[PDB]
Amino acid sequence: MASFEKFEPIFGEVVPERSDLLRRCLFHVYASDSYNLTVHVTDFISGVWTTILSVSQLDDMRDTVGIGGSWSEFVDYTVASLKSDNVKLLLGKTARLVSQKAKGMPRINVPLTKMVESSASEAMANLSLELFRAFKSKQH
Amino acid sequence: MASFEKFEPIFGEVVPERSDLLRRCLFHVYASDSYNLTVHVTDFISGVWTTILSVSQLDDMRDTVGIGGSWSEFVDYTVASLKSDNVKLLLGKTARLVSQKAKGMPRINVPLTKMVESSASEAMANLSLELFRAFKSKQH
């Protein structure tokens, strides 16, 4: 009961909010293996931001961000937070996709790094291809 | 009664097929202005195949395709044809997105050309960003 074996993919939009061209970005959350969660954020022009979040590091965040309780409660909150319109993107080489379900709610901070040229293109292709497959499935 | 003013965008999947790498492609059909139809086909890795179809060239195909009837009937056929699973991509800087609503129906051939690098990136960004907006509206 602590594995992403049955985790449906997550798609969403984020607006970059750096403080020195900031276009509109899409992100993709999905299970690479039954224990890791891979995140991709991209505007499809300025590369791809990626990281992999395993059950261990996912739990370490749960203790440091105050939200206590069973594993399902943290992951169910994260799904609701990451699929709500309150997902902001703070750009700085690195970036931190911050999300919260409601205002003054526990704040989820997923640190990010910029992709390599080889995988940046492959990342966007998967994001769109999976988003379409998820779109075409919600029609039938 | 011959304008693309009330034309919903179309998204779909197509598999290329050369005759001489090959990955999977998504396409996007939409009205740039009330008289032209812009199509984008891309695998998000190699490039973007694009053209723009005004009402004139669309009508010239109506005579060559053989399907006869009212404008609205032909365009409703093209809408149904481009949303079926019979969409092929024939590569030969050229391409021919051929579609038919079903097996044994008139076949619609939309010729294509390869984009330039500057707008190719923006083309994929628009397809995906619009695909998400269409996805979030259907899940409403």
Automatic annotation (TrEMBL), chains A, B:
It comes from the Eukaryota. GO terms for cellular component: ribonucleoprotein complex. One of its GO terms (biological process) is response to water deprivation. This is U2 small nuclear ribonucleoprotein auxiliary factor-like protein. It comes from Arabidopsis thaliana (Mouse-ear cress). The lineage of its organism: Eukaryota, Viridiplantae, Streptophyta, Embryophyta, Tracheophyta. The gene is MBM17.11. The chain holds residues 1 to 152 of 236 of the full protein.
